[PDB]
Curated annotation (Swiss-Prot):
Function per UniProt: Catalyzes a reversible aldol reaction between acetaldehyde and D-glyceraldehyde 3-phosphate to generate 2-deoxy-D-ribose 5-phosphate.
PANTHER family (alphabetical): DEOXYRIBOSE-PHOSPHATE ALDOLASE
UniProt pathway: Carbohydrate degradation; 2-deoxy-D-ribose 1-phosphate degradation; D-glyceraldehyde 3-phosphate and acetaldehyde from 2-deoxy-alpha-D-ribose 1-phosphate: step 2/2
Gene for this chain: deoC
Protein known as: Deoxyribose-phosphate aldolase
Organism: Escherichia coli (strain ATCC 8739 / DSM 1576 / NBRC 3972 / NCIMB 8545 / WDCM 00012 / Crooks)
Protein family per UniProt: Belongs to the DeoC/FbaB aldolase family. DeoC type 2 subfamily.
Keywords of the record: Cytoplasm, Lyase, Schiff base
């Protein structure tokens, strides 16, 4: 009802990945097939840079060329070496990424260094925007933990030109929570960047009910029209099965 509407909405905002690994060509091909669901396409697939060329061919051949290819750089570590983060980002662009999700140097921020996060994000944004590629910034809210640090990483990422702020890599003990999702969307609101900055929930949401709860935070803060594919994603694998079950598939 409300849950079927929210489940279809969430499905169309998914950056689809698998739990175990989508980096053998056969697993990347299977992921591309999975993204083309009976009720619509996911917003994107999320894969490692080396998987992009075969993913692009697979998406074209199955007649879903508008499924975005998102990838990851500086990942999953969020090290504070800008030259490495930037080189990986330029490689991701060259492979053919539509979007790059770079990991913010969160341990550097936890050690009191705000500048390196600004400089790393800004360099990667400039490279991506020069190639018409969107930059998401993974702040790893589940490692920052402290509300003030989650706000500060979000603020720095936005000031440095992030097109999205993303909770998590998906590969640490704590990924998204409803609390970190709310804090990060509060920062988008408080900085006046709702037009230019999206929010991505990585992990946390496992069920159709969870997806409804996470979207309800966006609807509360920004109104129900805000959370389109340019402004909201679910970084998810197992969630898709739950959304399809809520919609009467499997």
């Amino acid at each position: 009802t409300d849950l079927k509407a929210s489940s279809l909405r969430a499905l169309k905002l998914m950056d689809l990945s698998t739990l175990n690994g989508d980096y053998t060509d056969e697993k990347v091909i299977a992921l591309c097939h999975q993204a083309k669901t009976p009720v619509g396409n996911t917003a994107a697939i999320s894969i490692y840079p080396r998987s992009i060329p075969i993913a692009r061919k697979t998406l074209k051949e199955q007649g879903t060329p508008e499924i975005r290819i998102a990838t990851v750089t500086n990942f999953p570590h969020g090290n504070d070496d800008i030259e490495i983060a930037l080189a990986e980002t330029r490689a991701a662009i060259a492979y053919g990424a539509d979007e790059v999700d770079v990991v913010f140097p969160y341990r550097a921020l936890m050690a009191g260094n705000e500048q390196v996060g600004f400089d790393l994000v800004k360099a990667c944004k400039e490279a991506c925007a020069a190639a018409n590629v969107l930059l998401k910034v993974i702040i790893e809210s589940g490692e920052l933990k402290d509300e003030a640090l989650i706000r500060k990483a979000s603020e720095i990422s936005i000031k440095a030109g992030a097109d999205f702020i993303k909770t998590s890599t998906g590969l640490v003990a704590v990924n998204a929570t409803p609390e970190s999702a709310r804090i990060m969307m509060e920062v988008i609101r408080d900085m006046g960047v709702e037009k230019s900055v999206g929010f991505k929930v990585t992990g946390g949401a496992r069920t159709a009910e969870d997806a409804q709860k996470y979207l309800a935070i966006a609807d509360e803060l920004f109104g129900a029209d805000w959370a389109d594919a340019r402004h909201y994603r679910f970084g998810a694998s197992g969630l898709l099965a739950s959304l399809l079950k809520a919609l009467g598939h499997g």
